[PDB]
Amino acid sequence: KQPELESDEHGKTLRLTLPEGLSGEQKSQWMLTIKAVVQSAKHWNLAECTFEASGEGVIIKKR
Amino acid sequence: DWKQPELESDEHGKTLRLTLPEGLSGEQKSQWMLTIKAVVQSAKHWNLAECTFEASGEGVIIKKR
């Protein structure tokens, strides 16, 4: 399932789906990587960051 | 074994490194990369410091009232 944006009369909701049947720790690792991005969006303005793919996964760069 | 999200810095630069969840099929890896990509893209339209983040059933949610 691709990202889904639900629009409520009470606001919007971005819903992200995790792959079918992942294990328990794979689910946490995944979750943790997304939260690191939301945390970084609180310190940095991500529209002004460069986002590249790396060997291990991904890299978000500021300055 | 699995590296947690970590920052790296030095002169003229600060980076956030994210490691892929382990034991993933090529498909799931593609899915993982798109999820991270959907999140940076939302931070470009919304201010995520003013949004709620939480785990739901088989996923994650980000709400902007």
UniProtKB/Swiss-Prot annotation, chain A:
Residues 1-63 are annotated as: Oligomerization. The record marks W30, T33 as: Involved in oligomerization. Coiled coil: none annotated. It is found in: Virion; Host cytoplasm. Phosphorylated in the N-terminus by host CK2. Phosphorylation of the phosphoprotein is required for the transcriptional function of the P-L complex. Homodimer. Interacts with the L polymerase; the association of P and L forms the polymerase complex and positions P optimally for encapsidation of newly synthesized genomes with the nucleoprotein. Interacts (via N-terminus) with N(0). Interacts (via C-terminus) with N in ribonucleocapsid (via C-terminus); this interaction allows to package the L polymerase in the virion and positions the polymerase on the template, since P acts as a bridge between N and L. Belongs to the vesiculovirus protein P family. The N-terminus is disordered and is involved in binding N(0). The region of interaction with the L polymerase is necessary for transcription. The hinge region is highly variable. The central domain is involved in oligomerization. The C-terminus is basic and essential for binding the N-RNA template. Nonenzymatic cofactor regulating the function and conformation of the RNA polymerase and part of the transcription and replication complex. Binds the viral ribonucleocapsid and positions the L polymerase on the template. Acts as a chaperone for newly synthesized free N protein, so-called N(0). Plays a role in virion assembly. This is Phosphoprotein. It comes from Vesicular stomatitis Indiana virus (strain Mudd-Summers) (VSIV). The gene is P. The chain holds residues 109 to 171 of 265 of the full protein.
